[PDB]
Amino acid sequence: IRTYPPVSFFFEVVFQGENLDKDVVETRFQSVTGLSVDMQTETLKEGGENRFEHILPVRTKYDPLVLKRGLVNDSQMVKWCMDAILNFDIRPMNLLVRLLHIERSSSTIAPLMTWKVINAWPKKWSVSEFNAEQNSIAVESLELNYSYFETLK
Amino acid sequence: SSVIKPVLKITNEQQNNLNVHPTGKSINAIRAFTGKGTLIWGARTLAGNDNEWRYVSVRRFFNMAEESIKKGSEPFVFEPNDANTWTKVKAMIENFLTLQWRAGALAGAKPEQAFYVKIGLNETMTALDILEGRMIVEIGMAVVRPAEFIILKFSHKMQ
Amino acid sequence: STYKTPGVYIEEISKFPPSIAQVETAIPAFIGYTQIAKVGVENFHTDADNLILRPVRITSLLEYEQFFGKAINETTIQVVIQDTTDSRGNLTERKASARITSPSPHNLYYSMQAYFANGGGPCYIVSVGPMSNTGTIQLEALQNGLAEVAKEDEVTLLVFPESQSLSDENYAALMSAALEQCANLQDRFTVMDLKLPATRPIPANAIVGASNAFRDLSLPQDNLKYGACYAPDIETIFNYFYQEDAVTIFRSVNGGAEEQDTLTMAGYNPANGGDGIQYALIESAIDQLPLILPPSPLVVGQYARTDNTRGVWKAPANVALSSVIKPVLKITNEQQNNLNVHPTGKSINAIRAFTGKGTLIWGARTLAGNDNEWRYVSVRRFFNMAEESIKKGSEPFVFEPNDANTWTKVKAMIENFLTLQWRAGALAGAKPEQAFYVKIGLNETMTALDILEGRMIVEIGMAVVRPAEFIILKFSHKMQ
Amino acid sequence: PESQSLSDENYAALMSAALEQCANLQDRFTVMDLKLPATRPIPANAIVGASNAFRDLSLPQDNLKYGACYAPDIETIFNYFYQEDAVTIFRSVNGGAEEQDTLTMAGYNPANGGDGIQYALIESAIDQLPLILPPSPLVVGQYARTDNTRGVWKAPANVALSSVIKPVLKITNEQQNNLNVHPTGKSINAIRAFTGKGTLIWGARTLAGNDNEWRYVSVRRFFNMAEESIKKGSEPFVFEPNDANTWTKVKAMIENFLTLQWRAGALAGAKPEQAFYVKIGLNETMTALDILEGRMIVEIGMAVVRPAEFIILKFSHKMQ
Amino acid sequence: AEYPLPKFHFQVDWGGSRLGFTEVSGLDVETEVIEYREGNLPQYHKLKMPGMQKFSNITMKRGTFQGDNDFYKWWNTVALNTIERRDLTISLLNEKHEPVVVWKVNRAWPTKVQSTDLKGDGNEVAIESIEVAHEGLTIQNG
Amino acid sequence: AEYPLPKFHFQVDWGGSRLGFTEVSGLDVETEVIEYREGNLPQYHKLKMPGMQKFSNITMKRGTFQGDNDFYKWWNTVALNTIERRDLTISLLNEKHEPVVVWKVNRAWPTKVQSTDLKGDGNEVAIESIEVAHEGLTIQNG
């Protein structure tokens, strides 16, 4: 029975794709978010029943996936994205998102939780503001569409 | 799991003499219930008339607690037989029992209501005992016990 | 078993929790019959005559058990099973209860258990003979024990837990001898219990007849400042010792008359082929009996606690008792009116229950309740403490030359002790000169006749304070 | 370390000579191992027969306070030395009987035209052999560690062993009952595995286990240390004039040493005067006869403490 | 009696090789206060009621000897969110070298280890220090 | 033994010409604490668990000699975001002039250089100082 909850800052992302799963710089990210699902419904009122109304299920919606890094000047991933965006040529991929921990029985790094993200393709790309008077890092941000995600049980 | 069926069907009138018997030699039953499957029914030991050791869970809990206390206390063997070692072992035992109270295994609203631990000269030990190499600790623990029978009563409400 | 391998061994033993204390002033002596009484290689009870009588110093219940054993079996326990049945004989409900018809008079073990539960310290045990199933208690054995206890100097309190089974004349004789040696030694105090009618249930207003019977005992008039009496008996939480095959079983059905069965508990034990369900029921019934004790050992334990917490110059009253369920009799204000103040001066202190508080000791007056100096227990206990400590301090000056220098030395010692006592708050006054005085000198306290023959005479005076007992109130309406 | 291959009579003779010179020099201690049956696999309850055989060795009765015995042998992680062409190869198929091949490892070495795949397999197999040693050198290493970490006056027990896989025999409580306490006093200490802890030394008693003064190893080791250091400190006073001034000097030296030892926590007592005493003087410790012929006599007493071995527990139910 | 006790004779059991320390602090227990008032109270100040509890950290100092590196080892036992936890017992002794007041600390683990400062003209020893977090503490007097 | 060590005999290796310094500080290791509680815990105080690590900067002082300008050179090695990084080793010695406690510092680089103050009546020497950033530190005793 659990006594202590897990920690959020040890994680990884894997691209199961063209040949990006073996490229080391393609797994290192500063931030990952957007993993949430929502059910959308409608409301129906029945005459004579004044104590409650009926909520009926309609459809399912998912959030976009957002990744943030320091700027990498030569990236195969960015070539894939810009091929989709400039030449209207898209080729969706599959992804894995992992939450990691230390297991020992000496010790080893092992996955703790894994999600499969199915049919991802580019949505948005951006780079942060250049300012002559601030100490900052050039940070690039990518946003992706996908169909759904599942737990690797 | 992975069970088709019991070979014999046991009814309530038959389990009446299996759960309670003048000898105390209780027998637990495996029974099928409709819409549920095959369940274990009865949690009593072969000492079913004993006011302290009727139930399986109480003895299993006592065994777990005793072995863990034993493991925790073992590092203190071959130590000088003095007040400092007594203090050390007492603190270890109270910390373990506090962790067990916190988990919900012991009864009481506060730790002081759940257990007590005692050691001392002319309290648990004697003078001569000190001269040989023996330590005596007295521990008490409070537990809870399950309910087996539920009785329903019906009547006609006046309109 | 005997341990041989150097590891941790685990055993399941059922018993009560231990309790010890550090006590400096309240050292009592208990006189009674014991089970074993074997010390070293000498059996004190080896012979039926020529018993060895000597006190032994004990600091805990474990040490008591080491030398004297525990107890004997009761032989008078009965259990009644009540069955509620149908018109056809079908059982609907079954219950059980236990009762004792005539307890044994030998009770030192339970008394020591109650004593240590209430904060007692080191004590002296004197055995007067072995416990026996006939229950015979003799005046001569108890008086021999009292005569033997005269040789130990630390003893401060005298207790006879078995006195209530003694007849009135023998009771009066024993207590008169105890008061006489308290007066002769000048450093002891006696605690007594009141004898109640031995009936069950106890009738209404039994306390009045019991008080009247007590008032008529022939006791020496000028020694009554050396003792106190408490009432009534107390129901506590401890268990009886019994032998399984000696318990008698009765049955009753639908409220009818009881019928004696042909079996004992040994016939229901499943190890012998009995019905174990009713056996478990009977055992649970027996465990619920309350145990009835006289109040005196709890009073002594509470004396020890009160001296440790407040001071000996305070009254040992308005204090709660431990491990107590209930008094056997209920005493009201209109009844205590004749127990606290009476033309004879033979005051009796009461144990009373107060709502939300429990069972308290109410009253702190001695058997000389009309004496303008020695009414209160705390004043005499303080005087005894001060006198014995002065005695101990002065003893090193015996066999010294009888001259002015020794007089000066002893005077300085006494003034220093009384100054330390004034500082603690025990004596009245804003300055030492208002609290006490000490004097010695030729033609002041001594005539030369006493000087030449080897005597010294010192005169000491001390100022103390006394408690208030009644608090009154006036309620009125205020003009708006 | 090689004593276990020696016959029982010669083993007894060797150990008796060792104990005799320990008693003569007054500053040494002997560590022994128990001889086990040389069978593979070792049968059940071999430890009982081995103990019985040990009890029957003829050893000098009054020197048994100068040694200790440990059991059993230990499997460790080190490798054997071997020559490649001396290793014999066997084969078995589908669980059948073994058959001896005509080649050695030298015939599988690819440098000689052999099959290198099976050669690599054979080498990996050989590297996995555990090595079996008697316990005594590990006990001596652990003595050194315990004196560095706790102090010599502590028991050298309840300590884990390093680079050890496993004891060869499993000893239970019912068997150690007759190993720790026995009418002869010839105690045997045990090496036992405890779950989650590893392999520990259990028992700290000497071969004089019934002696009210010299049961425990730590007491004798402490006495030996103190006596040799006092000896070293006193040696510079030899050949001095036999007079009161030298007696005073040596007494002061001894009291200063014992005071430093009391301060460290090795001696019992709240004050130095409760821990030790030292005395020398004419018609107190010396008669004039010893003085004139060149002898000095000093009487020294020391107070120590002793360990507890058994811890007991009482479990009960509390009224709700 | 009528005389108090001193603070110069104690002992700490923490799972190390040495029981001696130079300084011991941070023994404290605290509780929160909640305030409340209704509109028509003839009283204009707020009412108080007990809340949650709070315990402080423990700080201990010691001199540096040769061959002793226990503080760093215990600190370095840390893993991502796991660490070895210990039971810490601090006692107060009398003149017969026996305990008098005991502080019992559950599930202690170190959070900070501070090494010494070096000064050439310094006529002082090398002092290291540690700070310990722990769930709850208890006090036993007598 | 029973005697502690002093702090007036040490040595620093930093990649310069002189190993002598007047002051050495900032040797410290720290870890964060995370608190947590669920609703039905019979305990009203929060639970603690280890978090991330944190190291402090290093400050060192020295007197000013003629012909020695190493601090400014190392500081001025800086480029837009690049700089020369060094391994810094600090030791503690005994009476035979050998080491006893070692601090090992990875990837040090300077962040601040402070020059002296000038006073006409001042009967004191000229003291310069530096502050050093570094990823991680280690402690070796024995």
B75 touches chain D (CB under 8 A): yes
Helical segments of C311-403, H only: 333-340, 377-394
Nearest 5 degrees, angle CA C285-CA C288-CA C293? 140
Sheet holding D131-133, edge to edge: D131-133, D74-76, D164-167
- β-bridge partners, C42: C39
Six-digit token string for C326:
């209930």
Question: What's the rounded Cα separation, in Å, for the pair F112 and F130?
Answer: 6
End-to-end CA distance of chain E: 15
* Cβ neighbours of E54 (radius 10 Å): 13
Question: What's the rounded Cα separation, in Å, for the pair C234 and C239?
Answer: 14
Six-digit token string for C91:
């059982």
**What is the maximal distance between C-alpha atoms in chain B?**
82
Question: What's the rounded Cα separation, in Å, for the pair D79 and D126?
Answer: 9
For helices C333-340 and C206-215, what crossing angle results, to 10°? Answer: 0
Return the C-alpha torsion angle C175, C176, C177, C183, nearest 10. Answer: 110
Q: Which chain B residue lies closest to D316 (C-alpha atoms)?
A: B140
B102 touches chain F (CB under 8 A): yes
Three-class SS of residue E75? helix
Six-digit token string for E15:
């799972």
Sheet holding D67-71, edge to edge: D30-33, D67-71, D189-194, D198-202
| C284 closest CB neighbour out of B21, B51, B70 | B51
B101 touches chain F (CB under 8 A): yes
Residue (of A70, A74, A73) closest to A31 by Cα position: A70
Which residues fall within 8 angstroms of residue B91, CB to CB, at 6 or more apart?
A: E87, E89, E102, E104
Contact assignment for E11 to B84 by CB distance below 8 Å: yes
Six-digit token string for D244:
């009161």
For residues E55 and E78, the answer to whether their CB atoms sit within 8 Å is no
Q: Which chain B residue lies closest to C122 (C-alpha atoms)?
A: B122
Six-digit token string for F96:
């035979």
Tell the burial category of C246 from Cβ atoms under 10 Å away from its Cβ (0-12, 13-18, 19+).
middle
Backbone torsions φ then ψ of D81, nearest 5 degrees = -95, 135
Contact assignment for A7 to F51 by CB distance below 8 Å: yes
End-to-end CA distance of chain D: 62
Q: Is beta strand B134-141 parallel, antiparallel or unpaired with respect to D310-317?
A: parallel
- DSSP letter, residue B55: B
Question: What's the rounded Cα separation, in Å, for the pair C123 and C26?
Answer: 9
Contact assignment for D306 to B143 by CB distance below 8 Å: no
| Residues of B with Cβ-Cβ distance to E99 under 8 angstroms | 83-84, 87
Contact assignment for D314 to B73 by CB distance below 8 Å: no
C14 touches chain D (CB under 8 A): yes
Nearest C-alpha of chain F: how many angstroms from A4? 8
B38 touches chain C (CB under 8 A): no
Tell the burial category of E39 from Cβ atoms under 10 Å away from its Cβ (0-12, 13-18, 19+).
exposed
Question: What's the rounded Cα separation, in Å, for the pair A15 and D8?
Answer: 73
What would the DSSP string read from start to end of E124-138? SB-EEEEEEE-S-EE
Residue (of F100, F74, F105, F71) closest to F89 by Cα position: F105
End-to-end CA distance of chain F: 15
Question: What's the rounded Cα separation, in Å, for the pair C315 and C302?
Answer: 11
Helical segments of C287-403, H only: 296-309, 333-340, 377-394
Q: Find chains touching chain E: ≥3 CB pairs under 8 Å.
A: A, B, D, F
Q: What is the CA radius of gyration of chain F?
A: 21
Q: Best of A101, A105, A108 to disrupt the E interface by mutation (most E CBs within 10 Å)?
A: A101
Q: Is beta strand C227-231 parallel, antiparallel or unpaired with respect to C349-354?
A: parallel
Tell the burial category of C20 from Cβ atoms under 10 Å away from its Cβ (0-12, 13-18, 19+).
middle
| Residues of F with Cβ-Cβ distance to E118 under 8 angstroms | 7-8, 10, 23-25, 92
Three-class SS of residue B1? coil
Residue (of C309, C392, C235, C427) closest to C26 by Cα position: C309
For residues F129 and F61, the answer to whether their CB atoms sit within 8 Å is yes
Question: What's the rounded Cα separation, in Å, for the pair C134 and D138?
Answer: 69
Question: What's the rounded Cα separation, in Å, for the pair D208 and D216?
Answer: 9
Question: What's the rounded Cα separation, in Å, for the pair B142 and B106?
Answer: 6
Backbone torsions φ then ψ of F60, nearest 5 degrees = -135, 140
Question: What's the rounded Cα separation, in Å, for the pair C405 and C321?
Answer: 52
What would the DSSP string read from start to end of chain D? --GGGS-HHHHHHHHHHHHHHHHHHSS--EEEE------SSPPTTHHHHHHHHHHTS---GGGGGGEEEEE--EEE-PPPP--GGG-EEEE-STT---EEEEEEGGGT-GGGT--HHHHHHHHHHHTT--EEE-SHHHHHHHHHHHHHHT-TTS-S-S-BPSSEEEESS---HHHHHHHHS-TT----EEEEEETTTEEEEE--B-TTTT-TTT-BHHHHHHHHHHHHHHHHHHGGGTTS--SHHHHHHHHHHHHHHHHHHHHTT-S-SSSGGGTEEEE--BTTTB-HHHHHTT----EEEE----B--EEEEEEEEPP-
Contact assignment for D317 to C6 by CB distance below 8 Å: no
For residues C189 and C226, the answer to whether their CB atoms sit within 8 Å is yes
Question: What's the rounded Cα separation, in Å, for the pair E89 and E70?
Answer: 17
Q: Which chain D residue lies closest to B125 (C-alpha atoms)?
A: D312
Six-digit token string for D197:
């802890």
What separation in angstroms does the CA of E54 have from each of B100, E28, E57? 21, 9, 10
Helical segments of A44-143, H only: 76-86
Q: Which chain D residue lies closest to C9 (C-alpha atoms)?
A: D312
Question: What's the rounded Cα separation, in Å, for the pair F32 and F50?
Answer: 6
Residue (of C136, C215, C217, C216) closest to C173 by Cα position: C217
- Kind and range of the H or E element at C60? none
Chains F and B touch (3+ CB pairs under 8 A): yes
| Residues of C with Cβ-Cβ distance to D157 under 8 angstroms | 6
Question: What's the rounded Cα separation, in Å, for the pair C277 and C280?
Answer: 5
Q: Which chain E residue lies closest to D269 (C-alpha atoms)?
A: E96
- β-bridge partners, D279: D299
For residues B48 and B100, the answer to whether their CB atoms sit within 8 Å is no
Question: What's the rounded Cα separation, in Å, for the pair A101 and E135?
Answer: 24
Amino acid occupying residue C299: V
A135 touches chain F (CB under 8 A): no
Question: What's the rounded Cα separation, in Å, for the pair C275 and C96?
Answer: 15
Question: What's the rounded Cα separation, in Å, for the pair D126 and D86?
Answer: 13
Q: For F35-74, b where at least 16 C-beta lie within 10 A, e where not — what string?
A: eeeeeeeeeeebbbbbbeeebeebebebeeeeeeeebeeb
- β-bridge partners, E99: E93
- Kind and range of the H or E element at E20? none
B72 touches chain C (CB under 8 A): no
B130 touches chain E (CB under 8 A): no
End-to-end CA distance of chain A: 20
Helical segments of chain E, H only: 70-75
C279 touches chain B (CB under 8 A): yes
A7 touches chain E (CB under 8 A): yes
Three-class SS of residue C117? helix
Which residue is associated with the tokens 């400062």?
E117
Return the C-alpha torsion angle C376, C380, C385, C390, nearest 10. Answer: 140
For residues B108 and B142, the answer to whether their CB atoms sit within 8 Å is yes
Nearest C-alpha of chain B: how many angstroms from F32? 24
Nearest C-alpha of chain A: how many angstroms from F27? 27
Three-class SS of residue C209? helix
Contact assignment for E17 to D150 by CB distance below 8 Å: yes
- DSSP letter, residue B95: H
Question: What's the rounded Cα separation, in Å, for the pair C20 and C301?
Answer: 11
- Kind and range of the H or E element at E77? none
B29 touches chain D (CB under 8 A): no
| Residues of C with Cβ-Cβ distance to D197 under 8 angstroms | none
Six-digit token string for C93:
């409900």
Chains C and F touch (3+ CB pairs under 8 A): no
Which residue is associated with the tokens 């540096």?
E64
End-to-end CA distance of chain C: 82
| Residues of D with Cβ-Cβ distance to E11 under 8 angstroms | none
Question: What's the rounded Cα separation, in Å, for the pair B82 and B133?
Answer: 10
- DSSP letter, residue C281: H
Nearest 5 degrees, angle CA B60-CA B63-CA B67? 145
Question: What's the rounded Cα separation, in Å, for the pair A107 and E79?
Answer: 10
Which residue is associated with the tokens 């019994």?
C242
> How many residues in chain E?
142
- DSSP letter, residue B121: B
Question: What's the rounded Cα separation, in Å, for the pair A18 and B41?
Answer: 58
Amino acid occupying residue D85: D
End-to-end CA distance of chain B: 49
Which residues on chain E place their C-beta less than 8 Å from a C-beta of chain B? 11, 13, 87, 89, 91, 98-99, 102, 104, 106-107
Q: What is the CA radius of gyration of chain E?
A: 21
Which residues fall within 8 angstroms of residue C130, CB to CB, at 6 or more apart?
A: C33, C34, C35, C37, C45
> How many residues in chain B?
159
* Cβ neighbours of D171 (radius 10 Å): 19
Six-digit token string for C291:
């145990």
Nearest 5 degrees, angle CA C84-CA C88-CA C93? 20
Question: What's the rounded Cα separation, in Å, for the pair C53 and C36?
Answer: 13
Q: Find chains touching chain C: ≥3 CB pairs under 8 Å.
A: B, D
Question: What's the rounded Cα separation, in Å, for the pair E126 and E116?
Answer: 6
Which residues on chain E place their C-beta less than 8 Å from a C-beta of chain D? 17, 95-97
Question: What's the rounded Cα separation, in Å, for the pair D315 and F134?
Answer: 56
- β-bridge partners, E12: E90
Sign of CA dihedral C90, C93, C94, C99: negative
Question: What's the rounded Cα separation, in Å, for the pair D62 and D211?
Answer: 11
Amino acid occupying residue C258: E
Question: What's the rounded Cα separation, in Å, for the pair D184 and A11?
Answer: 66
Q: For A64-102, b where at least 16 C-beta lie within 10 A, e where not — what string?
A: ebbbbbeeeeebbbbebbeebeeeeeeeebebbbbbbbe
| B22 closest CB neighbour out of C60, C63, C270 | C270
Q: Is D79 left (phi over 0), alpha (psi -120 to 50) or beta?
A: beta
Question: What's the rounded Cα separation, in Å, for the pair C423 and C432?
Answer: 8
Question: What's the rounded Cα separation, in Å, for the pair C181 and C29?
Answer: 14
Chains C and B touch (3+ CB pairs under 8 A): yes
Contact assignment for A5 to F51 by CB distance below 8 Å: no
Question: What's the rounded Cα separation, in Å, for the pair C449 and C442?
Answer: 10
- DSSP letter, residue C344: T
Contact assignment for A7 to E82 by CB distance below 8 Å: no
- Kind and range of the H or E element at E13? strand E10-13
Q: Is B24 left (phi over 0), alpha (psi -120 to 50) or beta?
A: left
Return the C-alpha torsion angle F73, F78, F83, F84, nearest 10. Answer: -10
Question: What's the rounded Cα separation, in Å, for the pair C247 and C243?
Answer: 7
Contact assignment for D270 to E17 by CB distance below 8 Å: no
For residues B102 and F38, the answer to whether their CB atoms sit within 8 Å is no
CA C346 to chain centre: 19
What would the DSSP string read from start to end of F109-122? EEEEEE-----SS-
Q: Find chains touching chain F: ≥3 CB pairs under 8 Å.
A: A, B, E
Three-class SS of residue C73? coil
Q: Best of F31, F49, F81 to disrupt the A interface by mutation (most A CBs within 10 Å)?
A: F49
Q: What is the CA radius of gyration of chain A?
A: 21
Which residue is associated with the tokens 């709660």?
C320
Three-class SS of residue A62? strand
Which residues fall within 8 angstroms of residue C240, CB to CB, at 6 or more apart?
A: C74, C77, C100, C286, C289, C291
Sign of CA dihedral B103, B104, B110, B114: negative
Question: What's the rounded Cα separation, in Å, for the pair A113 and A32?
Answer: 15
Contact assignment for C12 to D315 by CB distance below 8 Å: yes
| Residues of E with Cβ-Cβ distance to D270 under 8 angstroms | 95-97
**What is the maximal distance between C-alpha atoms in chain E?**
71
Backbone torsions φ then ψ of A131, nearest 5 degrees = -140, 125
Q: Which chain F residue lies closest to A137 (C-alpha atoms)?
A: F81
Q: For D142-166, b where at least 16 C-beta lie within 10 A, e where not — what string?
A: bbeebbeeeebbbbbbbbebeebee
C91 touches chain B (CB under 8 A): no
Cβ within 8 Å of F, E 66-125: 66-69, 72, 75, 78-83, 109-125
What separation in angstroms does the CA of F19 have from each of D159, F62, F90? 44, 10, 10
